[PDB]
Amino acid sequence: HMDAITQVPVPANEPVHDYAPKSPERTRLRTELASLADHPIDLPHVIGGRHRMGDGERIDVVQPHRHAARLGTLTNATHADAAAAVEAAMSAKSDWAALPFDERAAVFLRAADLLAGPWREKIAAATMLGQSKSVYQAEIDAVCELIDFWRFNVAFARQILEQQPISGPGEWNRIDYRPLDGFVYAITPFNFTSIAGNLPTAPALMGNTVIWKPSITQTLAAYLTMQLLEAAGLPPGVINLVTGDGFAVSDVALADPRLAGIHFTGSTATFGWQWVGTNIGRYHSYPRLVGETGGKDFVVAHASARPDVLRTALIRGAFDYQGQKCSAVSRAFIAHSVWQRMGDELLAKAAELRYGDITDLSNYGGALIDQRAFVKNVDAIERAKGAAAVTVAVGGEYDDSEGYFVRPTVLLSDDPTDESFVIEYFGPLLSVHVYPDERYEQILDVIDTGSRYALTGAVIADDRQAVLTALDRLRFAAGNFYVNDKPTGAVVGRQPFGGARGSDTNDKAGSPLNLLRWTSARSIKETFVAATDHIYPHMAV
Amino acid sequence: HMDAITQVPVPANEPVHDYAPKSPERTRLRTELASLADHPIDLPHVIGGRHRMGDGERIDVVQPHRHAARLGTLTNATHADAAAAVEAAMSAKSDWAALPFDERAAVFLRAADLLAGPWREKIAAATMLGQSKSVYQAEIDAVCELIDFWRFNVAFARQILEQQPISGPGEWNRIDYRPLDGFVYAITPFNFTSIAGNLPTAPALMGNTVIWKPSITQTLAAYLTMQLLEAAGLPPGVINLVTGDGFAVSDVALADPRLAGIHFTGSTATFGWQWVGTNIGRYHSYPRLVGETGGKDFVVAHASARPDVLRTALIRGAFDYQGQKCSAVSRAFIAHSVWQRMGDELLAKAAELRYGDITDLSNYGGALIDQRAFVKNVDAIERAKGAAAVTVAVGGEYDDSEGYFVRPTVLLSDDPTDESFVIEYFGPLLSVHVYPDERYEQILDVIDTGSRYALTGAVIADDRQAVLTALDRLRFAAGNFYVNDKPTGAVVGRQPFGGARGSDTNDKAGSPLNLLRWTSARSIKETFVAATDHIYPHMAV
Secondary structure: OOOOOOOOOOOOOOOOOOOOOOOHHHHHHHHHHHHHHHOOEEEOEEEOOEEEOOOOOEEEEEEOOEEEEEEEEEEOOOHHHHHHHHHHHHHHHHHHHHOOHHHHHHHHHHHHHHHHOOOHHHHHHHHHHHHOOOHHHHHHHHHHHHHHHHHHHHHHHHHHHOOOOOOOOOEEEEEEEEEOOOEEEEEOOOOOHHHHHHHHHHHHHOOOOEEEEOOHHHHHHHHHHHHHHHHOOOOOOOEEEOOOOOHHHHHHHHHOOOEEEEEEEOOOOOOOOHHHHHOHHHOOOOOEEEEEOOOOEEEEEOOOOOHHHHHHHHHHHHHHHHHOOOOOEEEEEEEHHHHHHHHHHHHHHHHHOOEOOOOOOOOOEOOOOOHHHHHHHHHHHHHHHHOOOEEEEEOOOEEOOOOOEEOOEEEEEOOOOOHHHHOOOOOOEEEEEEEOHHHHHHHHHHHHHOOOOOOEEEEEOOOHHHHHHHHHHOOOOOOEEEEOOOOOOOOOOOOOOOOOOOOOOOOOOOOHHHHHOOEEEEEEEEEOOOOOOOOOHHHOO | OOOOOOOOOOOOOOOOOOOOOOOHHHHHHHHHHHHHHHOOEEEOEEEOOEEEOOOOOEEEEEEOOEEEEEEEEEEOOOHHHHHHHHHHHHHHHHHHHHOOHHHHHHHHHHHHHHHHOOOHHHHHHHHHHHHOOOHHHHHHHHHHHHHHHHHHHHHHHHHHHOOOOOOOOOEEEEEEEEEOOOEEEEEOOOOOHHHHHHHHHHHHHOOOOEEEEOOHHHHHHHHHHHHHHHHOOOOOOOEEEOOOOOHHHHHHHHHOOOEEEEEEEOOOOOOOOHHHHHOHHHOOOOOEEEEEOOOOEEEEEOOOOOHHHHHHHHHHHHHHHHHOOOOOEEEEEEEHHHHHHHHHHHHHHHHHOOEOOOOOOOOOEOOOOOHHHHHHHHHHHHHHHHOOOEEEEEOOOEEOOOOOEEOOEEEEEOOOOOHHHHOOOOOOEEEEEEEOHHHHHHHHHHHHHOOOOOOEEEEEOOOHHHHHHHHHHOOOOOOEEEEOOOOOOOOOOOOOOOOOOOOOOOOOOOOHHHHHOOEEEEEEEEEOOOOOOOOOHHHOO
8 A cells, every 4th residue: 555645746837849940859740740641540449448440431531731641541430339438438447446546647647748758749740630730739739738738637636635624623524536427428629639638538537437539630649649648558448439420429428327427629519418408317427518619709909009919919819720729819809090000911911821731831820620611611701702791801712622721811891890700610710890999998898799609808908998998898708818919728727717608617628627527526524422312402401 | 996915704613502501592592482483574575675575475484393373474476576586686786796805705704793693593593483493403504504604605705716827927817706697596495594595695705696585484584584684784686585486486587598597405306407408598698507405314333333322323313303404314224233232222212302392492303394294204104104124113103283293203124225215205214224243245235236315324333444344335325424423414614515426516505616606717818028920930941
């Protein structure tokens, strides 16, 4: 055994490498890019530790920006694959939950260090290739954010474990953070390798076992993530990877009475789940549904905005990763006088911005993720051309012949930009409304009244009263709020929480609150000299 | 304004007074009991601060243990009453949320001190009278637990507010704990005046406004609680009391798109809500359903149990408040050799235990809460007589002619006691299975396999290995676990959490996690010198 009260290593955010010319990481990245691109692989299910192709339909995983180039091939999970994944998860449970916390933690700390060192460029390259990220977008996601999730989750879990009660005289009260009963189903989106590795591993840390269904277009990085976790010592069957479109997996998982929870991130059309509220009397436990939605963000620039700050925040905010982060800047509200100072430069920089094959590191970004996404963006661009209220100021061109390429596009809207248009796609489309300087407060009212799907908002202003007025008036109109920068993805530990207006997602990844969803806390009270007569003092004569 | 980082008063659990003969609190309590019993009152709705009887059916509130004696009369809320309560809550919202935390906190701290001092015996007496509690049961509930909820909730909320993120170089990150949008619907049970005052006031503390529908049989203490809160300075319309059976209130509340959450505690048949998953697209926010269930508890006595400890724990655990706490001991599993030492004394003490009018402080307890509860207990007692597997060892008598009185009853079961029988009622009925000493581990297996509705369990054993074996084997069979004492209601801050097997109720009253359900946290990031060029280092030639 062990007689100790141990402490975990203290986490700090992983440094972001630049991959500048002549840097050694750039050289290593080239090697991994060649190696994955030139040697495509089978992308098997991983069930009970066994890597195996199943009997379902073969589905190719390709490079979005060069969709003739295959990266691998997976098999669409069948009902039998899914049932096997569930059994394996249940069979691993007892040995996994019985491992002390510190041994469970070590797996994830070791994974973090493996990802920071020897697997770093490989996992980054895989994310570049399959999800069409530039090296910077890959690095902040697949490397830094996933490393951070693991190290910070370990520290968060350790902090949870030491939250203990008061013992009164004559007793000792303690709290045991039990894992859940039954397996956790994690369903992960294309957009982030970090979210994809975190959703299955966070519940696993707390002693649970898991079935993990990654998104098809992210499955190369997801398979490699599974390999990394195995190399870190994750025991067989603690997490079980099932590839494909997810339909047969949900049919099995949602019908199984042992379903203890769902950790999911993607649309709010898949947030609709209904299917669990139906079957409630079939489940041994009440399933825990722990989800994040996407959304579309706004920036408001007061007359005191710095123009080069605003311009850069718009370009990065809208066009980083081709507008495909969980949210992206879709609507800007810019004071007339500031638009005079930077409107031409915004349009010119957007016109010059290079999207292409992300193995050419000079490009700013890549292509859209797949054909469905390309079509939604074509449809939005064509709506904008046809719409009276909207002019295409720059961009708008698209060509799916080599990759799913859509050019950065800036729309000018004469009337405040209407949120419902902006939500039908994820893509590099920025809508700008120019408003008279003196109408700042009225525009804040319009944003507030007309924004239900903003995860984030920003105010660009040097004037402190303008800043505070935005923080006050838009307090409920977005979930995370930015001052003088692009509103974007959080860094772990730095910008937790948020969500769209009205959401209930304080328990999303990024704080201890997520890890508490994967535990069932119980109090233990021992009384040292309990009563030996039942009569109470008030009862006396 | 205010330039400060303030601290709240440090909470400690409120001392329990004994009301022993000749004590001054006993004298004060008699006066309040006479005063409430001898002067029944209208029990009006309290809407927007206006106390008014509505046009619904008149319903008397009586003393359960002397049901001819009226305490008051209320009116069953109509749809119009409920719609008015909602409007008032929404109208109070803006001024309430705009009050600094400290001013919101002061209301509840002041209420706590009012309840500890000048309102103490009044609120206790009201709870005795209407809910048929002995003075001790009233004191730990209506006084100490409610005081504790208020003082500890204030300290918990303050602790939440200072949970803040890391700021990296060049930035400042902060977290704002916003109240919810829309009103909170609190529905409270008969069993506890503390839970009844806490469910509406906890969300109110965090800046929300509320409609509160108390249980009919608890409405005298609930009305007086509302008066106390007004005397503490709760502003009009922050909490709106609507009396009655709740049906017209739920029709209005659940149809209103502004419903932000439900704080509820009672059966798990009312936990079934479905009605919110139906209407999901009608709501501005995703409603937050924050609930506790009841259940029935067990005690296992190993051969090393102290007999007088076991006996007392069984009597208090089963027969305190007539078995009507949120859970009560319904099943005991006692080693043969220990049953030889205390079985006769258990039966004799149970036969002598006095239930009667709780204005006679010599009585141990009172009557059951109402006629429906009386009938369920009659039905369970008659099932036990008819059942082959079960003998009535003592008690079993009942008489509803003056009050809803059921005698403490002990059933002997030859085969391990089957949980499904025990859950159909709340009442003073204890089922005992005597098992051979050497079968301890096998009985732990039976308890584990056959207990889905235990909130709490206890092991009575001086032998440390027996203790640890129960803590291990029954780890998932109950929610809170007790060693050498009765398993019972928590003291605030001392035995948080738990729930029945499979439940998802870590967010129930009693920790900071409950208060976080009534907030929507957002991150605010300010960047001091943001980028003025969008190009990334990797893009260079």
